[PDB]
Ligand binder design. Structure first.
Ligand SMILES: Nc1nc2c(ncn2[C@@H]2O[C@H](COP(=O)(O)OP(=O)(O)OP(=O)(O)O)[C@@H](O)[C@H]2O)c(=O)[nH]1
Ligand SMILES: Nc1nc2c(ncn2[C@@H]2O[C@H](COP(=O)(O)OP(=O)(O)O)[C@@H](O)[C@H]2O)c(=O)[nH]1
Ligand SMILES: Nc1ncnc2c1ncn2[C@@H]1O[C@H](COP(=O)(O)OP(=O)(O)O)[C@@H](O)[C@H]1O
Lengths: 420, 431, 430, 76
């Protein structure tokens, strides 16, 4: 249930002077060069070390997915919630990790690989029946703009509502059901087209909006029939980069929105601080980002933060800011509740099944007690046990008396010795 | 050259705005015909903050009056300073909102809001540099609260970076005027939390207490309450209009006052409020002004600060005064009442000084306190809102206007979140 | 600009309209001829180019005598001659006669006249329908007219100032029948219904005005004063303006429950006047005295849900607030648990005028308290018994059936008022 | 709503009656309300290759559908 803050480093194709190191895959250290001119032998700040749940110096997207969110998606299919969101520097590979270029776009990135594994899991678990929904909303200038379906672009009726049944959801968000991998890919790529990206010096196409792609999973058992259903979530979030706002300069929707991005990120960090201090209320309403991630970062959700950093000779300050935020995030640990549906018809049917089976068993035991229950019967007819073994492939009952027919003939001789 | 666009909403807001414009014109030496008659350079120096010059010497306020019934603005136009306002800045509907926030925000305010924004844009684009807008209105009223919140949302969308100041008359604790006051107030607080950058909470019963206990008046009509509110609305921005030894504009006050964005509701008071009998008997000193300032009775909000904790508190003094005197007095106040002051802010005081006191007063001072005491006002309004909402009293009037039932629950959730927010910073500990 | 269209149906409607229009003429200074020697008359009078003012009223009746008294009285040049509408045969205390047989052509003509009156309205706050529950003209024709107004005009605020039968004393015999029928009819159409009882107004006249021999003119004068105090904020400015559309939003919690007790204060003659201070607190206490109610319905039995106070004259908000604070702190007065505010205070700067020849004195202050309370279920309890007591064996039922009804309609009305009964019990109980 | 409340009250009364009958019976077993620890089913399926067993009165959903058909015939 802990927060697994992983770190991923952008491979500098230019191969700049890299100061980061990893000795064992857990700790990362950065040595800021002391300024010789400024106060010789009078500075005393050179080293900054941190410990996280993992570091990825140079890995492929397949390895990144396997080590990042495989467990979270598995929990999602096990009924738990999940939340993987990226943070770091602008152009540090946040969007690259969060479904970026990858390699050849053939199930590369994080979200496409995630949905591929989602539907592979749905196919493989032919026992239980799944209902998968997706949604893709962008927070731009503290306004929620839905991308899937039609794109009004006006933030119409889009408001984050509190936990109806212990999970935060979005009112007015166009939830799109998915039944195959191709339409999931199509919806995601429609979101990719629709999201707002702008030119920037650090990144050619900087993401200027916190995009949130939630995969809602609705479980139902193999028998189904309104039993243990619905109420599972998985939020894949690609935040917008934290710009120093000294290179952008231009107010033409590059600095004005950068200020909003910085404010949202600072509110997120303040929420993280309050959660680490474990104060009572830890406000979530101060921005749409915390409002969306209210259930995440707390609630009942398995969160795994990703910290995309960029090791460059001058990017050390931004890298250290990202590392400090990640370190303070690592303090957190959330809950994991197997929340399921609160459907009225579901409850009614599921425990009318209960009442009928209870009255059936009560009648059977009452008749056995009153009329008389005969034990140790049909001990010579092994054909009954053979028929039980044959019908084990189908749905049938067994004799209740004599230790339940000797545990159903020792489970049909251990299922005929595991089918020989 | 830092202009302020004034807007009045509803009957209470329009009356308060009329009194405010009367007081401002008086302080700038402007007669009701618009001609300047003050005989002082400083009065005309920064007149462009509130007034524009017409073809002649006339100075017209930069004010916009809204209403859904024309009777209130007919009374305003018949008032002593009714002719200064632009004839084009009177925007009215035909049928008033029957104390219905839903009517004033969705059905009836929707048609008038286009004209309101047209006039507001016309006034704002004319401004060289715009400090922002100030909207005077009352929570617990149909057209007032509804159109005020709708207009504030629209102006927030149009001018996100410009300052927004609101003077909201929160429904009084003990005696309520309208029955649906809890509904209107709860729905309006939801909008003010999200949209208004800076909000002033005023209660008519607190004003009655201040005018009956300090002013010792016998028959305090609404004119007197509007006069006190107007004095405070002038005092908040006199640093924009007059030279100051340590000046502080609206954005500076907001920055130094608001620790966290949602905690932008302030209780305010004016000094020196002296009874006619003891006017000669009172001595005008900065220590006396501060002592009257920090009294709970001086507060124009019902909540008394003793229950809560002062997150921050600004004081805009006016007059020829010693900054050493002012700073020493407020530091002494903080040290003596440290229990009522937040620990995780080393100095809870934003002191500013202006060199031009209001006419007749040698010295004055307006106070703006952000304290967790307002928790109890929000809590009381919720104690009434939940009682009415459990049985859905009067809910059909709001529902038939095309507002979902879910909106009431969402607004209550937001308001209770604000309450708990105040409580968390009331009992939060350092380290 | 803020016009209100007035309808007076039946003998009681027209006879309270006489008092109402005398009061309005006196308030606006309008001479009975039609012209007076700004625009405060607009609520009740539309001025012509010649300077004559014609009131926006409609005197509807199936009996000619009551209308002819106006046609020959002092106010013959004031009202529009066609606005005075007369029928041929009286409805004869028969709800069915006034609702099914005679009422048809008359209500058609009335709708035409009301339409052309409303076409003369810039704005329209609503209608003032004044009738007497308990008579065919009042009950039947008034119910039909309200149905048609709800169908066509729609959301305009109709205030029905109905006169209900007194608990014990009464003038008709089939009064419970047509009262229950008209109550069923107007339960769903009028937006604010005001109950009035002749017995309660008689008791008020006997105890406060010391009139040992009250008459219908006096009753109608008090009723007119109540309506004028109600409408005062439409014509004269003051602190805390309260509007016709504001009444429902601040007084009607649920659409079914919109019946309201009315009480005026002070009610004194000249001889007793100027002998008491008549402070704001004292007059508010008097207005909330049970004996000052204009309905024989003790509020101590039930619980107040809303109270709209309408002050007229030299009243200051500090005084009204102190008075209402004392009212709330008083133990005898109980509000429901779910309405902690329960108060709509309103003030106006124009004191009510004194009608010469009346018994009301010249007082600088006045209070009109209109309260929505669950105690009013008591009057429905009385009528629902007086109805079924006759109904079980079907007394006078042949008369009503002979004008186009069935026992189906009677049973539907009876069960509808029973629904109102358990509704009142519901809103009363926690 | 009303049906849900009545059916839940009936279920509670049935559980109370079953407990009262078990009081006179040999011992008070589990109420068999549900199986939150679904890992017990996997443990039973694993032990199906060894000596074990736990059925009780409700048969535990027929030994969890016979250990899910013996793990689907040992994954076929
Ligand atoms: N308060 C009050 N009530 C009156 C007055 N005059 C008549 N009523 C009541 O009005 C009721 C009957 O009124 P109407 O129905 O209009 O009598 P009508 O005009 O002959 O018409 P019908 O009786 O229906 O045939 C009686 O029960 C009286 O109680 C009055 O002047 N003041
Ligand atoms: N200070 C002050 N408050 C007022 C005045 N008039 C009304 N109010 C208060 O304003 C509150 C709401 O009324 P309001 O919003 O003006 O009604 P609306 O304009 O129809 O929406 C009421 O509770 C009154 O107590 C006034 O002149 N001065
Ligand atoms: N393996 C990699 N790891 C990180 N970044 C990479 C990798 N390969 C390429 N990149 C670069 O990362 C950039 C994506 O940055 P992006 O995440 O969009 O920035 P922002 O964080 O502002 O959204 C691409 O332009 C690409 O050139």
């Amino acid at each position: 249930q802990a927060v697994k803050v992983f770190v991923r480093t952008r491979p500098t194709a230019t191969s700049g002077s890299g100061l980061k190191l990893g000795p064992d895959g857990q700790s990362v250290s950065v040595n800021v060069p002391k300024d010789l001119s400024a106060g010789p032998v009078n500075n005393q700040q050179e080293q900054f070390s941190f410990k996280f749940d993992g570091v990825l110096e140079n890995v492929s997207q397949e390895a990144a997915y396997t080590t990042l969110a495989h467990e979270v998606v598995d929990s999602l299919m096990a009924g738990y919630n999940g939340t993987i969101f990226a943070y770091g520097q602008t152009g540090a590979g946040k969007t690259f990790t969060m479904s970026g270029g990858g390699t050849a776009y053939a199930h590369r990135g994080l979200i496409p690989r995630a949905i591929h594994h989602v539907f592979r899991e749905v196919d493989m678990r032919a026992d239980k029946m799944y209902r998968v929904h997706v949604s893709y909303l962008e927070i731009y200038n503290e306004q929620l703009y839905d991308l899937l379906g039609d794109t009004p672009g006006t933030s119409d009726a889009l408001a984050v509502l509190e936990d109806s049944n212990s999970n935060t959801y979005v009112r007015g968000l166009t939830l799109v059901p998915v039944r195959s991998e191709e339409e999931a890919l199509a919806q995601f790529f429609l979101g990719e087209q629709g999201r707002t990206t702008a030119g920037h010096v650090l990144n050619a196409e900087s993401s200027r909006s916190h995009t949130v792609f939630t995969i809602h999973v609705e479980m139902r058992t193999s028998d189904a029939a309104s039993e243990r259903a619905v109420l599972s979530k998985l939020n894949l979030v690609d935040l917008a980069g934290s710009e120093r706002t000294k290179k952008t300069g231009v107010t033409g929707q590059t600095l004005k929105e950068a200020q909003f991005i910085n404010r949202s990120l600072s509110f997120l960090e303040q929420t993280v601080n309050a959660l680490s201090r474990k104060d009572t209320y830890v406000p979530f309403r101060q921005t749409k980002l915390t409002a969306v991630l209210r259930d995440a970062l707390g609630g009942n959700c398995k969160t795994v933060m990703v910290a995309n950093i960029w090791a460059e000779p001058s990017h050390n300050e931004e890298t250290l800011s990202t590392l400090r935020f990640a370190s303070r995030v690592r303090t957190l640990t959330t809950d994991l509740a197997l929340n399921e549906s609160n459907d009225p018809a579901l409850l009614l049917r599921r425990y009318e099944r209960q009442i009928k089976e209870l009255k059936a068993e009560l009648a059977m035991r009452d008749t056995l007690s009153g009329k008389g229950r005969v034990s140790y019967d049909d001990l010579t007819d092994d054909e009954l046990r053979e028929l039980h073994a044959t019908c084990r492939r189908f749905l049938h009952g067994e004799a209740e008396p004599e230790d339940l027919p000797a545990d159903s003939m020792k489970r049909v001789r251990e299922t005929f010795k595991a089918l020989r | 050259m830092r202009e302020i666009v004034h807007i009045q909403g509803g009957q209470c807001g329009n009356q308060i705005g009329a009194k405010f414009w009367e007081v401002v014109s008086d302080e700038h030496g402007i007669d009701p015909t618009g001609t300047y008659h003050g005989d002082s350079d400083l009065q005309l120096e920064r007149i462009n903050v509130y007034f524009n010059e017409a073809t002649g010497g006339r100075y017209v306020p930069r004010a916009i009056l809204m209403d859904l019934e024309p009777g209130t603005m007919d009374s305003v136009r018949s008032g002593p300073y009714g002719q200064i306002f632009r004839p084009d800045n009177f925007v009215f509907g035909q049928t008033g909102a029957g104390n219905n926030w839903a009517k004033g925000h969705y059905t009836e305010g929707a048609e008038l809001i286009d004209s309101v924004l047209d006039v507001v844009r016309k006034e704002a684009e004319s401004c060289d540099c715009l400090q922002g807008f100030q909207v005077c209105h009352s929570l617990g009223g149909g057209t007032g609260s509804g159109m005020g919140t709708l207009l504030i949302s629209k102006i927030r969308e149009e001018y996100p970076d410009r300052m927004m100041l609101t003077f909201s008359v929160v429904p009084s604790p003990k005696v309520s005027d309208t029955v649906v006051e809890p509904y209107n107030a709860t729905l309006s607080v939801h909008q003010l939390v999200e949209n208004a950058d800076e909000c002033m909470v005023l209660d008519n019963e607190a004003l009655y207490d201040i005018c009956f206990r300090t002013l010792k008046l016998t028959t305090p009509t609404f004119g007197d309450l509007n006069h006190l509110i107007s004095a405070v609305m002038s005092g908040i921005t006199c640093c924009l209009r007059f030279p100051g030894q340590l000046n502080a504009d609206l954005r500076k006050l907001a920055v130094n006052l608001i620790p966290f964005p949602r905690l932008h509701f302030f209780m305010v008071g004016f000094t020196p409020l002296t009874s006619r009998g003891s006017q000669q008997y009172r001595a005008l000193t900065v220590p006396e002004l501060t002592q009257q300032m920090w009294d709970a009775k001086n507060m124009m909000c019902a909540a008394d600060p003793r229950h809560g904790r002062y997150l921050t508190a600004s004081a805009l003094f006016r007059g020829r005064m010693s900054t050493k005197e002012v700073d020493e007095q407020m530091l002494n106040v903080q040290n003596k009442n440290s229990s009522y002051f937040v620990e995780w802010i080393p100095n809870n005081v934003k002191s500013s000084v202006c060199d031009i006191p209001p006419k007749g007063l040698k010295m004055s001072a307006t106070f703006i306190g952000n304290s967790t005491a307002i928790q109890e006002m929000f809590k009381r309004v919720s104690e009434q809102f939940t009682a009415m909402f459990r049985r859905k009293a009067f809910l059909h009037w709001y529902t038939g206007e095309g507002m979902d039932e879910m909106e009431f629950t969402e607004a209550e959730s937001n308001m209770n979140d604000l309450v708990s927010e105040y409580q968390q910073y009331q009992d939060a500990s350092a380290e | 600009m803020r016009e209100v269209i007035s309808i007076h149906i039946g003998q009681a409607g027209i006879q309270v309209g006489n008092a109402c229009w005398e009061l309005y003429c006196l308030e606006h200074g309008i001479q009975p001829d039609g012209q007076m020697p700004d625009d405060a008359f607009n609520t009740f009078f539309s001025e012509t180019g010649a300077g004559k003012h014609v009131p926006r009223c409609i005197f509807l009746d199936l009996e000619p005598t009551v209308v002819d008294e106006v046609r020959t009285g002092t106010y013959r040049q004031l009202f529009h001659p066609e606005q005075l509408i007369s029928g041929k045969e009286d409805a004869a205390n028969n709800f069915a006669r006034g609702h099914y047989t005679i009422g048809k052509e008359i209500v058609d003509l009335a709708l035409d006249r009301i339409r052309k009156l409303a076409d003369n309205c810039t704005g329209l706050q609503g209608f003032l329908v004044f009738n007497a529950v308990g008579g065919g003209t009042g009950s039947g024709l008034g119910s039909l007219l309200l149905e048609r107004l709800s169908v066509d005009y729609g959301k305009k605020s109709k205030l029905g100032f109905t006169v209900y039968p007194s608990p014990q004393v009464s003038t008709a015999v089939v009064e419970p029948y047509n009262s229950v029928l008209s109550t069923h009819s107007l339960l769903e159409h009028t937006d604010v219904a005001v109950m009035l009882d002749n017995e309660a107004i008689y008791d008020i006249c006997r105890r406060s005005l010391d009139i040992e021999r009250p008459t219908y003119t006096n009753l109608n004068r008090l009723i007119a004063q109540v309506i004028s105090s109600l409408t005062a904020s439409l014509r004269f400015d003051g602190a805390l303006n309260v509007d016709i559309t504001e009444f429902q939003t601040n007084l009607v919690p649920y659409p079914r429950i919109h019946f309201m007790l009315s009480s005026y204060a002070p009610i004194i003659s000249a001889e007793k006047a100027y002998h008491e201070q008549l402070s704001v607190a004292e007059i508010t206490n008097a207005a909330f005295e049970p004996a000052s109610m204009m309905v024989k319905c003790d509020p101590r039995h039930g619980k107040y849900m809303a109270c709209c106070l309408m002050y007229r004259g030299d009243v200051v908000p500090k005084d009204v607030n102190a008075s209402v604070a004392t009212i709330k702190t008083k133990r005898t007065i109980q509000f429901v648990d779910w309405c902690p505010t329960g108060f709509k205070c309103g003030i106006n700067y124009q004191p009510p005028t004194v009608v010469p020849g009346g018994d009301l004195a010249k007082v600088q202050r006045a209070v009109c308290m209109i309260s929505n309370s669950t105690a009013i279920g008591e009057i429905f309890s009385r009528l629902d018994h007086k109805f079924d007591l006759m109904y079980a064996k079907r007394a006078f039922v042949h008369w009503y059936v002979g004008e186009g009804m069935e026992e189906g309609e009677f049973s539907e009305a009876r069960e509808d008022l029973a629904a109102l009964e358990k509704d009142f019990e519901e809103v009363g109980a926690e």
